Amino acid sequence: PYFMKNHLGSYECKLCLTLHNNEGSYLAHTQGKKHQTN
Amino acid sequence: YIGTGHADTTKWEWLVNQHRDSYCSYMGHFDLLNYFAIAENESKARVRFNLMEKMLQPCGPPAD
Amino acid sequence: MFLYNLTLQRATGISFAIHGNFSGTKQQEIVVSRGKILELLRPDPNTGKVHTLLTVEVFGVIRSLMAFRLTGGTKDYIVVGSDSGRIVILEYQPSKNMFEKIHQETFGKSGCRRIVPGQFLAVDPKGRAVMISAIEKQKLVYILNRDAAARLTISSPLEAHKANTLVYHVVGVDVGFENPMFACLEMDYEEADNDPTGEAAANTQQTLTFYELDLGLNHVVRKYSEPLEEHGNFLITVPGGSDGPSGVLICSENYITYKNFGDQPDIRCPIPRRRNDLDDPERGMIFVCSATHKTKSMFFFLAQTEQGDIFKITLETDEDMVTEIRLKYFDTVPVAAAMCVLKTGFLFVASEFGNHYLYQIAHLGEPEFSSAMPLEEGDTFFFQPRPLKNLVLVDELDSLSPILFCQIADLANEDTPQLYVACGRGPRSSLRVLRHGLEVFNQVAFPLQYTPRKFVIHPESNNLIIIETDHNAYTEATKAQRKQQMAEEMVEAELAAEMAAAFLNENLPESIFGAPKAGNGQWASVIRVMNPIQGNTLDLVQLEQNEAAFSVAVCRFSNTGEDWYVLVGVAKDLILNPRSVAGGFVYTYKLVNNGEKLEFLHKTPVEEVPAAIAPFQGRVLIGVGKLLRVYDLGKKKLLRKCENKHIANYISGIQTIGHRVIVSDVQESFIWVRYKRNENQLIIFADDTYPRWVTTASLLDYDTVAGADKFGNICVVRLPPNTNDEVDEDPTGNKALWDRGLLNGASQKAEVIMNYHVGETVLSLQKTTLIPGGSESLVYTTLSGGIGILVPFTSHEDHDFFQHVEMHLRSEHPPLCGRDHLSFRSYYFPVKNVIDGDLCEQFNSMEPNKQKNVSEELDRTPPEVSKKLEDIRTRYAF
Amino acid sequence: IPYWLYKLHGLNINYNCEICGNYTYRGPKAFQRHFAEWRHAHGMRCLGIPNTAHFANVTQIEDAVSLWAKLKLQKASERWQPDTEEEYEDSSGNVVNKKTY
Amino acid sequence: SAREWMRICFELLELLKAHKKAIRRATVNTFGYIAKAIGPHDVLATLLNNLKVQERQNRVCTTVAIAIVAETCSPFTVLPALMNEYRVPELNVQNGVLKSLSFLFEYIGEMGKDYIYAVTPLLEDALMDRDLVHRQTASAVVQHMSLGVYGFGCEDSLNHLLNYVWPNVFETSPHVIQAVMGALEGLRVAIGPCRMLQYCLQGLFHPARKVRDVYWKIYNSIYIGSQDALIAHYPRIYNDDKNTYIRYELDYIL
Amino acid sequence: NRFTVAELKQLVARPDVVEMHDVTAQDPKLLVHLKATRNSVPVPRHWCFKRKYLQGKRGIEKPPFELPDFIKRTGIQDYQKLHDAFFKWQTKPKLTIHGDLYYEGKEFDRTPWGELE
Amino acid sequence: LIFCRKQAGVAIGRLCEKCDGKCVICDSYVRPCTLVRICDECNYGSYQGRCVICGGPGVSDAYYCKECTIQEKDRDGCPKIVN
RNA sequence: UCGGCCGCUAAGAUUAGUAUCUGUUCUUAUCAGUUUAAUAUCUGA
Ligand SMILES: [Zn+2]
Ligand SMILES: [Zn+2]
Ligand SMILES: [Zn+2]
Ligand SMILES: [Zn+2]
Ligand SMILES: [Zn+2]
């Protein structure tokens, strides 16, 4: 939904505007405070 | 290297470097010197000596 | 657009001249530096005619030149100090007729730098070492010796740097075979930069310092230093090692001083002054150049003053010391850049400007002034200048330096155009007419009184209207008044009356004795109508003292009809430095009697120097300071009809095409202005994106302007396509607050399409065909008396061929004085779209093996390369 | 809002504009943006001064008036005034302006 | 045989893993020898696929190899495929393309002038990129491009790129700022010291020491490089009460 | 001892360039003079932004880089066609003027003389 | 890393086998142009014919590349790395 | 307005640097000093 692959091959959250190296980085982010508040 | 500056270079230091570089450049470039000799109606030697004399304090005395 | 640059006439001005046996034989030659060209001259001792043996473009700025001979050597080498951060030693090869580079040692960055050596060059008199110095801080000494093969060797540089120190001059001291010594006139600026009262600067003394090179220890030591009573302008090496006392003469304002390290007392002699001199009483005197003549028996020096007088200087020595300096007036010649005494009995005087002279020294040199003669405060020695006695003129080399203005036109009705060239300088100024032909250009010279600034051709008679102006000068009326009051003061202070009557009748010609130097801010100016066929003055208007004419135009006004008017823009009481002026005037003359006589109409005052005047649409544009005004004629005045006030600094020139006006700023280059006839508005519509110190401009087409700058560059600026010149001023004046434009200037920018550094300052540019049936070229003339062209390639094939030739020659045949060619042509801006045909024609001068190597790279044969080079030359200009 | 963000945004610091009837803008970002916003524009309309980049960072009334006085005289001295500055001749070369002509 | 060399190409692709640099350097050259024999087409396809690797030693050596192939066989045969690989949404691939261009413009020198306008839009993309390496490597291209085309009237493209290089002067990352400074030294030569001085003027006396430190390190490099040329280019500074700052001789008219 | 922004704008020829932080310079008169100079280029706007230079460009699905038309019409997405791409069909891109710095939010007779025949 | 930067003399800089081809300033293998000169102090004694970059036994001449030459980086001084 | 604090780059060499998530982020009454472009930080009252 807010998961997008950038042109560099990394992943971004569209809601929080946070950069993630892999899917596991994003899934840890969704557990985090910044994603839950948004 | 003389004439470089840094974050505390003042107006006066920067301008004295430009004036000193300019006078040395005029002494070095024959046609630029010719142009000033013709404009002032002075001998080239007189022009050069007057430039050498301005090299000491080209912009007037320092601020502090 | 791609241009190729060719030189038609190489610069004729001489910056330096050295003497020596460069060929190895007993014949004495002269190597001369025109600024960017090194040239070998050989005066025939029989005829007394100077022959040029070799000229080479060095594509650099020669800043110093010296001749050296190793001990027991028979051939002199040439050492060059340049703007490349390299010292080069050259040897002339008479068999090949070329300068061979013997050594090139690198020590710093290129350009005329403040702290990188090159400005000063001194050689030990016995050839064991050379010092190269900067104006500031840095000095390098190279040891010179020979190997087993008797080939010259050069050491690593020994440094002799001191911080905060200005150098005025350096000479080698003739110590014989003792350790080499270099004398410097030095000044420390450190205390001046630290004192805000300004008192330390005023109390700063110049020092004479002697650097000794210990050959044993391999280091330069600053052995002796002594302050001076007043600042010297240069040093003379005095003969030594038992052919003289050693030490130096220091030439300073008003005095010549001899000093030597050791127990020698300093000996000082006043410089003799001309009796009844009309020069401003406040000014002092400097020697501008020296020559040494060492006969095996004796030595003398010839030194020339800035009024052109050569004095023979001899040192009287008692047991290896000097007791007195004696001065005898020798002769008056034009002010020299360099004087050189040839052992064959000839003296070569390389004029500061104008023609160079070779004299024969008929007699070796009236009162003999001396340092031993008593002199009171205010009192001085007085000599009387007189016509040539010790010298006999044998040859005169023509030089166009300085070319101040040029028009290429057919005024003679020859179908081939002539070049009408306004040459400086002062009372040695001339209008020269140059024709292509043998008597590359033949000249005829017509004298002028003051430095010609500008001239215009009257279309209906082909008469020239020349404005001549000098600073530091008296008008004829002022000089007469000054001479009457000096004769009155002579009588007041029966024998004096006879002396006064003699003085009023004595008329020393200014072309020979020089013009009297009036003070600062004193101008003399004349407007002269000259027939260009034979250069007879039809009319001469002398302007008032302290009015300086700077602009001139010939035009018709629409309201008055067919009558021709001359407008002269004059400044009133201009001080150059610091700049101030007391307003200016435009004078208006009607040019009557078939363009022969100037009949004064009116004088219109303006607030600033009207530096540029251009006929425009049956009216006139005038640039008054930084204001561009349209003026119409009127009856009592020129009437101001339109103004633009948005020009940045000062208007140096105006060119008009259609309703576009191209304005030259003194520093902010080209501004394009639209005139709206109906609205009566001058609107800036475009500008440049670079500062340029514009000297001259030429329009090439409706969108394109070629410019030259003070710094030696030529540029071509073009408006990009769909540049709209139709832009109007806001009638309410609200849009001016909102619109700020682009980069603090015009909203539209011109594009620079050509950049090239010529190497000499260009003061005229004109687009013209030089040869009938030939193609149009952009002709330019330089202040060093050089005439060149820039010609467009018509074909890609031809542009690509010459580009390839230039690429190979830049590597295979690199500039003699160690500069990189592409760097020199990109001196102020990166070169763009010009091939240097001065380099490409060096192909012909190369060794045949090198010619074969380059041509194989070009996939051509050397005759075929030479043919292509000639073909382009002949299409445009002989 | 967390205290670290309040200090980062500089909402601690308080800036006053008199053209806005002494309205206080908290933080430099809010204060440097208002000079283009409505409240400042309205205050400049009341004074009779166009809200240009000239008068950004000008908060006091007396300064904005004096600067507007300076600008108006500067722009009038910039511009071509053919009503007083064009020179005309009536008879026998008497220099007159366009009104007198 | 053509297939024999293509088998060797695959073996050479493995020799870029070698610890000794002399092997890797010799391997890179051999890729250019095969490209001269067979054709750049299939050998470049092999090299472009080796940009997807993780090892930095192996991927930099491919970028050297690609540029050698572009030097042996003129860059117009190689560039269309390198431009396409930039469209691949991977970091190491896009950085690899930029790195290949850096070496390409360094090898070809003056032949750069034919390929400036082609690469310019790609270098703008990279300089606009958030990624620091894209900006760092594209600054190295601008540096080598700039020095290659000096004296050939390509100032319009290089001044355009200066507009995307110049905002990175405030970068703190050492390899990024060293690449930017190297670009600026290169552009001083190609676009001229006047232009570079014009980019400096406003920051030399700026209030923040963040802006002056940087601007003086840049100005000092221009000054040392071009001391004599700057004489023409310094802006007019007006006289103050105590001090005269106008250079009056440059205002003389003849 | 500093000017106010109000006081500096009265003293300078270009009151609009004057910025809020300019009065805190060691020489505000020289600074505003240099900011008013023809063809000088402004300092990059982000010198005082807390965020690094382009770090704020995120959450955008920007399309893959568009190749120029002459390379696109080669059909890379024939070695003589590949030569004609660079040496015949090559067109100059839309370039930008001197001083037009990129910032994060920016993206989103009339015959000429000396012409070749 | 720190270059000597002392006035260079007549002595020619050398490179060992491993550093052969490299520019001493920018470490490029590409286009050698100008021959490297080193100072007398970097040449005197046991430092005779040693590599300008690392300091091993010299076999070939050191060159500045064309890019370093255009930039005049060959004019900066003795480029022997001392550290 | 999103700082501060606790995978990638260098044709490296055969170690140096640097992005990113997670978590934590100090409520101030009123001024002063230290500071900085400003803010913050630190230290007093
Ligand atoms: Zn999220
Ligand atoms: Zn407000
Ligand atoms: Zn060393
Ligand atoms: Zn290098
Ligand atoms: Zn080594």
PDB file of N, CA, C and O in Angstrom, chain F residues 3 6 64 94 98 101 104:
ATOM      1  N   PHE F   3      24.065  46.259  11.815  1.00  0.00           N
ATOM      2  CA  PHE F   3      22.915  46.922  11.213  1.00  0.00           C
ATOM      3  C   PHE F   3      21.659  46.098  11.503  1.00  0.00           C
ATOM      4  O   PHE F   3      21.745  44.894  11.697  1.00  0.00           O
ATOM      5  N   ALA F   6      16.541  46.621   8.342  1.00  0.00           N
ATOM      6  CA  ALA F   6      15.863  47.841   7.958  1.00  0.00           C
ATOM      7  C   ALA F   6      16.923  48.880   7.608  1.00  0.00           C
ATOM      8  O   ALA F   6      16.712  49.647   6.681  1.00  0.00           O
ATOM      9  N   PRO F  64      11.983   5.494 -15.278  1.00  0.00           N
ATOM     10  CA  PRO F  64      13.356   5.252 -15.730  1.00  0.00           C
ATOM     11  C   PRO F  64      13.803   6.299 -16.749  1.00  0.00           C
ATOM     12  O   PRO F  64      12.982   6.894 -17.447  1.00  0.00           O
ATOM     13  N   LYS F  94      18.206  20.494 -24.298  1.00  0.00           N
ATOM     14  CA  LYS F  94      17.844  21.763 -23.683  1.00  0.00           C
ATOM     15  C   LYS F  94      18.784  22.032 -22.512  1.00  0.00           C
ATOM     16  O   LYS F  94      18.797  21.334 -21.498  1.00  0.00           O
ATOM     17  N   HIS F  98      24.009  30.108 -17.561  1.00  0.00           N
ATOM     18  CA  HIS F  98      24.847  30.476 -16.431  1.00  0.00           C
ATOM     19  C   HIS F  98      24.020  30.887 -15.208  1.00  0.00           C
ATOM     20  O   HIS F  98      23.064  31.656 -15.310  1.00  0.00           O
ATOM     21  N   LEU F 101      21.098  27.507 -10.915  1.00  0.00           N
ATOM     22  CA  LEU F 101      21.356  26.363 -10.032  1.00  0.00           C
ATOM     23  C   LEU F 101      20.155  25.422  -9.897  1.00  0.00           C
ATOM     24  O   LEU F 101      19.002  25.838  -9.801  1.00  0.00           O
ATOM     25  N   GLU F 104      16.045  21.143  -5.067  1.00  0.00           N
ATOM     26  CA  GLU F 104      15.212  19.952  -4.927  1.00  0.00           C
ATOM     27  C   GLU F 104      13.875  20.050  -5.670  1.00  0.00           C
ATOM     28  O   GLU F 104      13.471  19.101  -6.349  1.00  0.00           O
TER      29      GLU F 104
END
